[PDB]
Write a protein that binds this DNA or RNA. Sequence first.
RNA 1: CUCUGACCGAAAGGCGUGAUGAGC
RNA 2: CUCUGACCGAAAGGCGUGAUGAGC
Lengths: 247, 247, 121, 121
Amino acid sequence: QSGARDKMVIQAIEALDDVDKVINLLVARLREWYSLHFPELDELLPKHPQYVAFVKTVGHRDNINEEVLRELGLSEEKIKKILEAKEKTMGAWMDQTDIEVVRQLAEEIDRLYQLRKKLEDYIDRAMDDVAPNLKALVGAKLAARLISLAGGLRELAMMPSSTIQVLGAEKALFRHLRTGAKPPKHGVIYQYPAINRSPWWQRGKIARALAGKLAIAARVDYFSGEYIAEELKKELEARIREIKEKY
Amino acid sequence: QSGARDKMVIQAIEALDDVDKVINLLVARLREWYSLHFPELDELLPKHPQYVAFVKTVGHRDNINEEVLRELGLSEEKIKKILEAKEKTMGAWMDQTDIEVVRQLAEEIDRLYQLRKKLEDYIDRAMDDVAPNLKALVGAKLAARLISLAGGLRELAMMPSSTIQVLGAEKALFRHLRTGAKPPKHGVIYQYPAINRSPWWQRGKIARALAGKLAIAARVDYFSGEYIAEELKKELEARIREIKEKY
Amino acid sequence: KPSYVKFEVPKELAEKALQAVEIARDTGKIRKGTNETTKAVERGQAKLVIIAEDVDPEEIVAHLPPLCEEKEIPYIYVPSKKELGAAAGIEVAAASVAIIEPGKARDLVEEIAMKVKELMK
Amino acid sequence: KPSYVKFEVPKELAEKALQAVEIARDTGKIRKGTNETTKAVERGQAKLVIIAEDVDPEEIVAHLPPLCEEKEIPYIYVPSKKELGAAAGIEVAAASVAIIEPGKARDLVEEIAMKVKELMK
RNA sequence: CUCUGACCGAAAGGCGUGAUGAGC
RNA sequence: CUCUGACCGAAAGGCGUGAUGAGC
């Protein structure tokens, strides 16, 4: 049992979100900065992982040609058009010293994407030793945010379903609770596919159903280690299609 | 001349601040997380590079021994501590998989520290081409903040000294300009040692002395590349003793 | 008797419990069902909580005993989750109930808790 | 004549500058000193600006010509910063001076701008 | 300091192991 | 959209290449 493993899982999911923040931050800098040398590449490569991968392995404009752009694995339209904008760009010239420091920034953002993947692998595997039922229902990541929002597995296992349904809506909840404003129907559980994409008019009842099952899965994970997730998912599948039915 | 190198120094100095933002964020996370395995190291290694270097090269409590701690290069009372706190700790146990992912985070932050020193040296060497005088008076880092706040060397070289004394105080200045409230006596130049460490009653006068000299230093860097910073650094020493003399 | 049943409840005590629930329903106030019951315990609004002993999965009511020890609320088992439910005035069953205000039952509540105070210790 | 002197001011014109500043001081409003002058230019409050040609370093006033061509304000050179200083009514020197409102000197201002429009083109 | 609480469905049935209402 | 603007010093002196006053 141990019993601190849920705390480390929490740390890791929070870590994942923290890592996400810095990637978004460094990438932005990377784009603003390499744009002094090559302004157009920005709109061409809206996908960060691709933009960072470019700067890192290509660098200065002089190094591009047809060759290196395929080994980068970008499509054929994308290549000739970036290849075109180059030979023709209005960007400032960079020295070898100048481009090297921005290539070092890219190299680091790449290390980070790998770190991000490492964390996401850890959470996914650790989640099988911590709350298998939660994983089965909502996915590894979502179950971690739930544990995380509640403060731990035990703290989750103690909550009424109605608290679970609103975890991660804390602002909305406390607003309602004070001024009698209309309550949130969902917190983080909105991510759950069946909720996030469904007629807006059945989203509330699905959240209510899912939270009920999440409460039972959490109590079992914590107090037994018994595996009921299959019944649970099926009984949930049942109740959703039944909701889907009449509306 | 080129003429875009001043925009590159700007990105670099903004980047240097971002890297600092992320290092903090991730180091705060490193400590919360590793503290689940080893609570007591937190206070014992208040200095970040030291905590990171530890988690990264030591890891699990089972590896701590008189040997590896000296090779990590920390003092004698420290290492007599950490050896009691360690075997007697109340922190949770960690498997191999659990500690491997937290050490990955600490290998990352380290890359980040090396990236920060790379930026710090790139600014320092770049400043020597871009604004040698500005660098001499205030140091490369501060000189880059000035250029950054101004919007570029040219913009900064078009300014009155009164603007330069307040660069970085943008809100307090506007608020003084709108309502009529007392003006800021300094912006970023507040870091100049002779300002922030001097009797509070002389700070405005040293600010206004330094702003004076920076405006002249920026005009020379931009319009000539002539090098006057020795006299400028003396006339300023004089004026600062002359200021200290009476107070 | 599933592990979450921490002590043995005399066939008698069980019978008063169910009728403490019944008159507390008409002359008093109760919250039927595990979520509402749990809510009641955390708000210290619970005089007593009845836990059925046939719950499936049994882990559903497994958080009540410790949560009750923490707020120092007395709790008793009854044999049937369907019986419990009819006692509270509902067509279906109920895995737990809490009495908020005992109404005309305060006598019964008191003595359930005294006879309970022993079985624990 | 240092590179920031972009045209050759006839010994006469210079002398009409110094007494335009002189009378615009008493009968009008001027700004003495390079930081006030530059402030007066960016605010379009400069009618004319006079710039000494003996400034050391010469880069202290080197931003005044470009900045003046963007706001269109006419500028002219006088040979001495001490002279310019006195003409402005101060004991020390002045690297540049701007007349805000000419006062009883506007006549001189206009013709300085006219003769100067030429030395540019 | 952490929503509501018995109805829903044309019926078959669903529903306190949570109906209904509800601002991630 | 980006402070103030001729004083300060017991004097020697400093000071529009910025005195004084002023909420990084």
